[PDB]
């Protein structure tokens, strides 16, 4: 029913280079400030899904150097991705997170022994998240999972704020989506009501993880080409949350009684993860990548002149601290100064592409129509993607066949 | 012989050690304490026939529109500057000009307060048409965090109200949202 | 996502930490406090046509001869049983 793409497509001996030049993202690492609903400084963090929608030149109307090979009848031209390059330029740095109002009341390890200060309140606490190093390339945007509060419970329950059902919501991973965490990839804006169980960056958003199961389980494999993953975490401190337990522990396991007791502690225990050491040797970027054979039936074919590259990197997530003076004084005064958190994130996207052709037969037309008809009216023989927000890059009028003028071209001519 | 470099600062706005627990209190006029600190471990060699450059963050042009302000966030801009002898390597605090943008002269060790650390830009060693600035480069850099603390002083960009619930006694004066 | 879980006990026999210093010797009435932890890092796959048998140390048969006891040490036995779902990792 479904056949590999290389059975019908044809690879030519034509290679072009594209470069995104300098890409910069500067903004506050925790929340997007806006004065009179005008976001001057948006959300910019090293803990952010970077989804780049690359638009491509039409190979059919492009100034092809050898138009003799091309035939307007029964032959169309598409771009095929060959090599990729993600140019990080910022130095190494671990991001810092936290929240001033969090439920950090007992230190179970008893080195600190916080002892749950009196009355229901909060306290300031901060930590770092895990080392996450992920990159994805594809002709379709990635799909990732997260659990959340979906449909209500079975039958007709009567309750007031009990445990909701858990549903595996699978959503397209767009720019503005929050990375996985050691606290679980939930919809904390809705599922969590305190807005105080996690640091400020993830309390009002929806963390989600790429569900590789459905990702690879696609019949056509349009949603992936190849994935690179490195993850590192280890729990550095153990603690509990306050509040009451709606699912109490049975008495059959715990013996209670006597003074200084008969009130059980919280059965809710979580941790603070840490990434430990970063290194340049463990880096997966600033190095050429070659697409020998994709796992799915899509050997780098960019249908519809659209490309999707998503990266998350924590090695370049260092948080910048700024200070300024309102006034000045003879002595050091706390009132004269204002403090700001600014984050930067630098990107280069460098690509080498190979020209691809196709011969139109009746079964070929039927297959290419069944898998996607939108491209079929594109070649002219309501995209839902306009609603979602991505980081768009335009690589039109930037393709160059003079690949020897670029370092990626040199590395490409090094091997074949 | 191999040896770890050490720096520090006697009067730094080390507000509160925050990791295991926090102590949110009203700050005084001065709360600076002596703090010792090491840097990220870095090995780097660059060679060529042209002097290598480096990126560093700084204050760019004046603020856009026609603004009147006293202590706002300045326009933060990348400046490409050629590396000379005497410059300091980037540490974990970011490749930027502390002498201009860090007003206290007190938020970092003294070795990097009045100076500027800048990290070399491999991207302009690559994207240059000739590559005269670089023949071949070696780097090996390792780093990991050991403590967490907040910063004293006012927060010029306060936290949004819809994300944080506050009330009752000991509050309506927010804690330090700056975390380093 | 790759993540580590936390267990613990609200009332565990955590008398005193002994790592660098120790408190007074004899306990009081009840010194049994809130403490949590995480377990060892495990990865294991077994594959076959017949289900695996695994062992644990348990109170086997009573002591030899005819001893009279009151909370004495029970004998140790390497008891073998088939691993079914619901059992939990060492």
């Amino acid at each position: 029913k479904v056949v590999a793409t290389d059975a019908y497509v044809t690879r030519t001996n034509i290679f072009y280079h594209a470069s995104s030049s300098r890409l910069l993202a500067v903004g506050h690492p925790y929340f997007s400030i806006k004065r009179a609903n005008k976001t001057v400084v948006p959300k910019v963090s090293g803990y952010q899904y970077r989804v780049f929608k690359v638009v491509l030149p039409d190979p059919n109307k492009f100034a092809l150097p050898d138009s003799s090979l091309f035939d307007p009848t029964t032959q169309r031209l598409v771009w095929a991705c060959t090599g990729l390059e993600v140019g990080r330029g910022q130095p190494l740095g671990v991001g810092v997170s936290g929240h001033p109002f969090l439920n950090k009341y007992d230190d179970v390890e008893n080195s600190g022994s916080g002892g749950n200060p009196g009355q229901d309140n909060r306290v300031n606490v901060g930590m770092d998240y895990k080392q996450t190093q992920l990159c994805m390339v594809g002709c379709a945007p990635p799909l990732g999972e997260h659990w959340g509060k979906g449909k209500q419970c079975t039958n007709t329950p009567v309750q007031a704020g009990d445990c909701p059902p858990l549903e595996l919501i699978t959503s397209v991973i767009q720019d503005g989506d929050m990375v996985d965490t050691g606290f679980g990839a939930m919809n904390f804006a809705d599922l969590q009501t305190n807005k105080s169980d996690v640091p400020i960056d993830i309390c009002g958003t929806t963390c989600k993880y790429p569900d590789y199961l459905q990702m690879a389980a696609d019949p056509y494999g349009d949603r992936l080409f190849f994935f690179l993953r490195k993850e590192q975490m280890f729990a550095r401190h153990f603690f509990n949350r306050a509040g009451e337990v709606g699912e109490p522990v049975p008495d059959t396991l715990i013996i209670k009684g006597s003074g200084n007791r008969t009130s059980v502690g919280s059965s809710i225990y979580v941790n603070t993860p840490s990434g430990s050491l970063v290194s340049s040797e463990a880096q997966l970027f600033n190095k050429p990548y070659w697409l020998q054979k994709a796992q799915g039936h899509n050997n780098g074919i960019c249908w519809g002149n659209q490309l999707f590259v998503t990266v998350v990197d924590t090695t370049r997530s260092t948080n910048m601290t700024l200070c300024a003076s309102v006034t000045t004084s003879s002595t050091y005064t706390n009132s004269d100064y204002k403090e700001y958190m600014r984050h930067v994130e630098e990107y280069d996207l460098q690509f080498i592409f190979q020209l691809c052709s196709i011969t139109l037969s009746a079964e070929v037309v039927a297959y290419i129509h069944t898998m996607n008809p939108s491209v079929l009216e594109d070649w002219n023989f309501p995209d839902p993607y306009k609603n979602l927000s991505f980081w768009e890059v335009n690589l039109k009028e930037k393709f160059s066949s003079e690949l020897d003028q670029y370092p990626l071209g040199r590395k490409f001519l090094l091997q074949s | 012989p191999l040896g770890v470099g050490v720096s520090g600062h006697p009067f730094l706005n080390k507000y509160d050690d925050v990791e295991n627990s926090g102590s949110g209190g009203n700050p005084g006029q001065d709360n600076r304490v002596n703090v010792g600190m090491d840097y990220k471990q870095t090995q780097l060699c660059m060679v060529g026939c042209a002097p290598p450059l480096g990126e560093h963050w700084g204050k760019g042009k004046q603020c856009t529109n026609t603004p009147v302000q006293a202590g706002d966030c300045p326009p933060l801009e990348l400046i490409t500057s050629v590396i000379q002898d005497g410059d300091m390597v980037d540490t974990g605090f970011g490749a930027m000009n502390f002498a201009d943008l860090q007003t206290n002269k007190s938020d970092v060790p003294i070795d990097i307060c009045g100076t500027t650390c800048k990290y070399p830009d491999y991207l302009q060693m690559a994207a240059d048409p000739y590559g005269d600035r670089l023949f071949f480069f070696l780097r090996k850099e390792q780093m990991f965090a050991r403590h967490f603390f907040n910063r004293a002083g006012e927060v010029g960009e306060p936290v949004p109200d819809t994300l944080i619930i506050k009330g009752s006694g000991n509050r309506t004066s927010v804690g330090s949202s700056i975390y380093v | 996502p790759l993540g580590v879980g936390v267990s613990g006990h609200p009332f565990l026999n955590k008398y005193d930490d002994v790592e660098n210093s120790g408190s007074g010797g004899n306990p009081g009435q009840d010194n049994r406090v809130n403490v949590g932890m995480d377990y060892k890092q495990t990865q294991l796959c077994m594959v076959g046509c017949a289900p695996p048998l695994g062992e644990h140390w348990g109170k086997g048969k009573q002591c030899t001869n005819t001893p009279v006891q009151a909370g004495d040490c029970p004998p140790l036995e390497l008891i073998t049983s088939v691993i079914q779902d619901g059992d939990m990792v060492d």
Partner: antibody
Amino acid sequence: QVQLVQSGSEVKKPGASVTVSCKASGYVFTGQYIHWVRQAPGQGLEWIGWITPNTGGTNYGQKFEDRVSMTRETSISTAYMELRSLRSDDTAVYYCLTRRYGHYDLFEYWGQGTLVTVSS
Amino acid sequence: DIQMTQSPSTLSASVGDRVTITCRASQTIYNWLAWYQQKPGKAPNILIYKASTLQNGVPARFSGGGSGTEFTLTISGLQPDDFATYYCQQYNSYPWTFGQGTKVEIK
């Protein structure tokens, strides 16, 4: 044993400043919350404020947030509290006291108290 | 500020009697309460906390209870050393506040 020792009783003129110190020993001094309260003859207990040696983070009551300034030092681990604009009604005994919230415990310690008398 | 009223302000009783002292809170406190007794010239110490929990080293004749704003303390059997001034303090919110006090003295 955790020992907390306050300064001796003092008599001062109105409008002046007083300084009350109390040295603590026998425990990790930095990680605890030390508190100032005062007891007037014929009236109940009331709370002045609280500081911890970490950060010197102060917090004052709504009543006495203006006339007081209080700090700590870790060399011999002593907390100082000074009062300005001595009103004649402030003649009272003053107590510094610390508390550790345990998992299931509360470790309570008080100073011996210091009498402060103000008159013309 | 959170206020409270202790009733009765003054009570007289003989040895071995059962006596109940109450206090009313201005706002809700739940169980964040403790009780103090002060002997003349000496610093008071904790006897009851958690609104129901005895402190260690203290005899079990001393009992506490209550919820919301209504809180009670009971002595089943008086002793001569127990005759002192009694207060209830919430540690709910800052500022900390104490009652007017309750003095007990032998009949």
